[PDB]
Amino acid sequence: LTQPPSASGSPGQSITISCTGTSNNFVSWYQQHAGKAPKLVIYDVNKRPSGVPDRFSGSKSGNTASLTVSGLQTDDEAVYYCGSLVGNWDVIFGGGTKLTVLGQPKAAPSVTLFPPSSEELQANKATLVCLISDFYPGAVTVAWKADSSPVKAGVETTTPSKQSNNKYAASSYLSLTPEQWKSHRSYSCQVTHEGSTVEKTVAP
């Protein structure tokens, strides 16, 4: 199931998150607070469970399923997963949608790229780290390139985390061989935030 990576809204506004790949009505959505267990906020599409506010509503149109949260509040900040029965008895889950009700204001990310050190190359290892921080929303994709052609190997990216200033931050780790590092002069790191991208490049 395909769930949007991120979602944002101000308190009182209404957010509608979608899900696709559901041919049946068994669609259900879950809410998981960070450092806690997931909780089912909806089941059998629109139907609500016990102790769940009316503002949560499930909907499915065609092959697309949708959840709607109106009247946003602090406690609505979490990761939202969707799931449904498929075929005979197997069940699958989406990637989940991260909805944040954190405080203002929006901001462009900040990238600082560090090439491998002299002591690191001695271990016959080469690692480049992109440091991205101070961005809103808290979901950002990172891409790597060598000279021109993109680099699809050695990419380790982790989920961003909120800072003391309430701005999110993330770091991507690229581990390769020293041979391809010295051969290729420049290594580019592309960081995509809300359509607009921020790039950095380093050469020995």
């Binding site: 879950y30 998981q32 997931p38 799931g83 197997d90 889950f93 989406g94 989940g96």
Partner: protein, 59 residues
Amino acid sequence: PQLQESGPTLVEASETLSLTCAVSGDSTAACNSFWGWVRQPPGKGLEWVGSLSHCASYW
């Protein structure tokens, strides 16, 4: 209704991981629901493991 997980938090590779759930407030005999597991790798999505039920049919 409370579900309490128990077992080794640290297991070595290639070995056998064993976990046991202790239910409280409900019977496993009940045919109203299935019982199983769902694991969530660190900073990742929810993946279905499996479930079973002794409440059977004629075959």
